[PDB]
Design a protein around this ligand. Sequence first.
Ligand SMILES: *CC(=O)N1N=C(c2ccccc2)C[C@H]1c1ccc(OC)c(OC)c1
Ligand SMILES: *CC(=O)N1N=C(c2ccccc2)C[C@H]1c1ccc(OC)c(OC)c1
Lengths: 306, 306
Amino acid sequence: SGFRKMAFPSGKVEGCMVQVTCGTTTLNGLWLDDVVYCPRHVICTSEDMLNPNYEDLLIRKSNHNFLVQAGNVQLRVIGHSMQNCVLKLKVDTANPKTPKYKFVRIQPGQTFSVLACYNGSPSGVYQCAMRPNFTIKGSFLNGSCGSVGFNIDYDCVSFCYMHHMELPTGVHAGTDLEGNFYGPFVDRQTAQAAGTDTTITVNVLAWLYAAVINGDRWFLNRFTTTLNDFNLVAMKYNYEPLTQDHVDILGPLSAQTGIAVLDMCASLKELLQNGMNGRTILGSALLEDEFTPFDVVRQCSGVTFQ
Amino acid sequence: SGFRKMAFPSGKVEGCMVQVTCGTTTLNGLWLDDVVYCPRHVICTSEDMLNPNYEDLLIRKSNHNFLVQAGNVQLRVIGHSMQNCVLKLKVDTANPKTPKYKFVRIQPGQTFSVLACYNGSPSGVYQCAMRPNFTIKGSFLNGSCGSVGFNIDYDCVSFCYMHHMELPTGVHAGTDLEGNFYGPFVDRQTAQAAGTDTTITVNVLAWLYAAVINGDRWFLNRFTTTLNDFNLVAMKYNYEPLTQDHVDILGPLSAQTGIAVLDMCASLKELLQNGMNGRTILGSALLEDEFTPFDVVRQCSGVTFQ
Ligand SMILES: *CC(=O)N1N=C(c2ccccc2)C[C@H]1c1ccc(OC)c(OC)c1
Ligand SMILES: *CC(=O)N1N=C(c2ccccc2)C[C@H]1c1ccc(OC)c(OC)c1
């Protein structure tokens, strides 16, 4: 028993992190097969970040201007190209520690583990959710760009995030591994607004099911509700509306606990209107939305990986 | 910026986890050099767990009764012994992935990362604190025994915890790597009481300093207090008393933020008596005590490892 915000084991990703230097800036890169992936703003000076013309800046660079280092081993760049907002550096050596992997573009509300790195070396690992407004609330300092987010399925590492920037509001933005930003952001040092952030309702419900599984049941009430009635209350409190796909995904948790999805919504509705009254759920005084239904099943069933 | 409950990268530990079978029970083991470490109750049946005579049970076992497996590689046990509550299995092969390591017995209030494992395979990693009553509030299912807790310093893995049991209250107990339990517990399936759990005050203060560093300043007040005056309030709310050693440890955080330790205590005193009034600190509606002063410095300065 117990419930924790646990990350994936990071071993398979630690072997893929390298340091990338171009001119004076040094960032992290991801080394898979004989290609290194890194944010394209590694080719910028501090002055270029206000209004960078990436095509014109990349022209002035040659293969021997990039220094890629894996610990003490040095890689030789034999070809470079720009794909959207990432740089792809072809190197002469294929990474012997390359795991089974794929590139995935996740949806808002999905969760992943971030391996925070500095100078190509791992600092720590934590779990987080892609917000509905396509930001993440991470923990990143100067030099962490190029750190990656990932999931593990079976023996396969699915890379889904590369860190590119901190917004003036202190939240974080980045791209998939094909270099397409999540959200309406651009890799430029300019004030950029993120939209309204909402709470991920299907995740909150998954967490209430986790709480029931672990013995927190005080919030279960006698009422029930309808989907339309619940969504009316949810939108007043800036919660994402629940759809039928969300009800389908919660099916297994409903089966295991014997609590129908709509009955759980009625409990949540009462928590939204009445608060928690100084009580806690799974050791928290706020409603938690960084666990997907799959995260709950995985943690409460003991799923392992390669 | 940002602040997260981040764990250490687990790669160096993933390469040390093995599966240990003796009779019908299968647990996790830790393979360093040519020795495997695992909980001694691997030699018990379900009936033996009520009142096990470990010496008499270990007599009936021979080297060829232990099956140790590292993925698909099979280790041959050539010698076994019992050190307190752990079994030490000598094997014919030395682990080629053995990192620089040491065994450490931590103190209550210190934090570490747990690599939760099942059948010798990693499931996830999370950070937690040793409670003042020598339990941990982890996330463990049947079969997780033998999972280890660890810290990383420089290039050295310090192992400090091996998981042995879940108490009837749903909290967890275990040993150091020499097999001495933390706390007054015994490896027997009997009702065992843990003492009163208190809040780790020096950790709460470290977290308030983290909050100031990241922009949460609303809780700073005009008052100050004395050490004796604060400890009187703290003990009424089941907080550990603050000593001079704790003030010394918080020194660097005081220097960085310009807020004296005693001034921060006065802010905390007001939070204890008046609550938080529906406000949050670093995204939490409760006072958090699972970050040590060192954890804050490490996260807010970007410390990396091998
Ligand atoms: C994340 C990261 O390392 N960096 N992000 C940068 C950026 C700035 C504005 C807009 C988009 C992206 C630049 C880069 C960076 C690296 C290192 C330092 O200090 C050593 C930086 O200081 C601000 C920035
Ligand atoms: C942690 C763990 O795996 N186990 N802890 C056990 C224990 C029980 C009572 C007192 C102290 C320690 C036994 C062991 C265990 C392994 C596997 C299963 O199911 C497959 C168990 O089921 C209860 C227990």
